[PDB]
Design an enzyme around this catalytic site. Structure first.
Site, PDB file in Angstrom:
ATOM      1  N   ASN A 188       0.855  -1.186   0.000  1.00  0.00           N
ATOM      2  CA  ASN A 188       0.000   0.000   0.000  1.00  0.00           C
ATOM      3  C   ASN A 188       0.888   1.232   0.000  1.00  0.00           C
ATOM      4  OD1 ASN A 188      -1.970   2.001   0.271  1.00  0.00           O
ATOM      5  ND2 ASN A 188      -2.477   1.401   2.374  1.00  0.00           N
ATOM      6  N   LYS A 229      -0.096   4.145  -0.511  1.00  0.00           N
ATOM      7  CA  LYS A 229      -0.858   5.268   0.022  1.00  0.00           C
ATOM      8  C   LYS A 229      -0.766   6.459  -0.958  1.00  0.00           C
ATOM      9  CE  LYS A 229      -0.647   3.531   4.791  1.00  0.00           C
ATOM     10  NZ  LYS A 229      -0.534   3.882   6.243  1.00  0.00           N
ATOM     11  N   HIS A 251      -9.661   0.782   4.530  1.00  0.00           N
ATOM     12  CA  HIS A 251      -8.411   1.154   5.201  1.00  0.00           C
ATOM     13  C   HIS A 251      -8.725   2.132   6.349  1.00  0.00           C
ATOM     14  CE1 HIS A 251      -4.337   2.686   5.991  1.00  0.00           C
ATOM     15  NE2 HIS A 251      -3.904   1.563   5.443  1.00  0.00           N
ATOM     16  N   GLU A 302      -7.338   4.727   7.404  1.00  0.00           N
ATOM     17  CA  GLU A 302      -7.266   6.149   7.035  1.00  0.00           C
ATOM     18  C   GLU A 302      -8.576   6.630   6.411  1.00  0.00           C
ATOM     19  OE1 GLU A 302      -3.534   5.888   4.855  1.00  0.00           O
ATOM     20  OE2 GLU A 302      -2.502   5.536   6.765  1.00  0.00           O
ATOM     21  N   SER A 311       3.067  -2.437  11.401  1.00  0.00           N
ATOM     22  CA  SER A 311       4.411  -2.164  10.892  1.00  0.00           C
ATOM     23  C   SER A 311       5.090  -3.487  10.488  1.00  0.00           C
ATOM     24  CB  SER A 311       5.243  -1.401  11.936  1.00  0.00           C
ATOM     25  OG  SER A 311       6.569  -1.162  11.483  1.00  0.00           O
TER      26      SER A 311
END
Ligand SMILES: [As]
Ligand SMILES: [As]
Lengths: 247, 247
Positions: free
Chosen positions: B9, B11, B93, B95, B210
């Site tokens: 991803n 982003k 997601h 976000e 992470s």
């Protein structure tokens, strides 16, 4: 009048085949007058439009952006667009103000960020049916414009284009050319009084209601209308007739 | 374990030059085991990634979509993506759930629409720091998953991949591999009990915290982790080491 602009907002529409065909038509259309044409395709279609559209009157625009790159899954940033060679962006479209959380302040910040990053900006304003019927047209469009203005230095206006969307007529009522002119004149007067007469004189204020081959000439004849942000008819060869109307 | 997936991803990050360089590195990386790799670039970068990325282990994904084409300025639709040749999409997601108004129900509908239009879907779930500290991890991730499940027929699950994002550890705390496994196991058990044991067995549940070259092997060793939705390290040659960890 300042230089007209005739901008296509394709919104969330298109296939590679339909784009290819329409872009060929746009490339074959002879434009002999001074007009800035703009096409704003969906993000995924920007590369193929940059590659296939070569009519020298045109620039490619994004339909939206966010200010900064980073951890913003699904969004596209202004630096990403600049790197890609895109220098125009539409911001504050009614659909984004309505569905996607763009308040006057969000739009104003986006416009200042786009200015600061070297974009030409088509900043959209407009009142709803509820607002118009409550006699709040002036307050709303001026409030939306004032929010933007408060974040801009005077020299930024060379990079700003306003687009008036009569949201009250879009998918509801019919907006007349006289109704459009009345709003454009109010906007121009406010800019003249609060920002400056030089700025007001040069400012492009585009009509973003229903624009067709049948009304484009009539609308462009109005003293405060400087072209169009075209919705549905911009997906059709009709967009050429709209351009021709700004002669 | 089912076939692993290692998904990038990106982003809202990238330049044409940085992409070109990273894609060359991804193309030169020999992968000898059965793994589905995925790259999700920003919308404007999808065409150049489709053109330059040819490592046959990979598919290209969108980072978001809306269900239908139409008057949705700035959005990209599933039919537009399908026409472009994109068959994978990330939905829900953190976000987007956090910044862009995607409630459990919005995400669930998007997932059902993507399923119905023939996408492979990486559906993202995860609890916040506030939720974790209130001992609501199970309720939250199960609620988010249940919302999705309620809109899907049993046969849809062949097209669903879950990604657990420990939002509580992303930009806050440190998530341990044991903490990750504990959530993945809870999710798998719920799917087994409420949907079916065959479905639970084949379901890919990806870790979306992470992920680094330093922890990928340790994480993939956990019985309920089937690969990764990688954030920051996916913009780096390190992404190859992450893939190698799923051997
Ligand atoms: As050409
Ligand atoms: As290749």
């Amino acid at each position: 009048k300042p230089q007209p602009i005739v901008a296509a907002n394709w919104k969330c529409n298109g296939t590679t085949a339909s784009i290819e065909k329409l872009v060929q038509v746009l490339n074959e259309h002879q434009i002999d007058h001074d007009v800035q044409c703009v096409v704003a395709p969906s993000f995924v279609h920007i590369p193929m439009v940059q590659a296939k559209l070569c009519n020298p009157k045109y620039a490619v625009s994004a339909e939206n952006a966010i200010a900064k790159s980073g951890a913003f899954t699904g969004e596209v940033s202004m630096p990403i667009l600049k790197d890609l060679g895109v220098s125009w962006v539409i911001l504050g479209h009614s659909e984004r103000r309505t569905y996607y959380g763009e308040t006057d302040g969000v739009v104003a910040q986006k416009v200042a960020d786009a200015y600061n990053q070297g974009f030409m900006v088509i900043a959209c304003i407009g009142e709803t049916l509820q607002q118009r019927e409550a006699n709040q047209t002036a307050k709303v469009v001026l409030s939306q414009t004032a929010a933007i203005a408060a974040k801009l230095p005077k020299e930024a206006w060379s990079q700003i284009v306003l687009a008036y969307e009569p949201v009250w007529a879009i998918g509801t009522k019919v907006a007349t050319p006289e109704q459009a002119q009345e709003v454009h004149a109010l906007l121009r007067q406010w800019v003249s009084e609060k920002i400056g007469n030089g700025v007001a004189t040069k400012l492009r204020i585009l009509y973003g209601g229903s624009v067709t081959a049948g009304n484009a000439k009539t609308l462009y004849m109005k003293p405060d209308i400087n072209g169009f942000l075209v919705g549905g008819a911009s997906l059709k060869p009709e967009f050429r007739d709209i351009i021709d109307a700004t002669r």
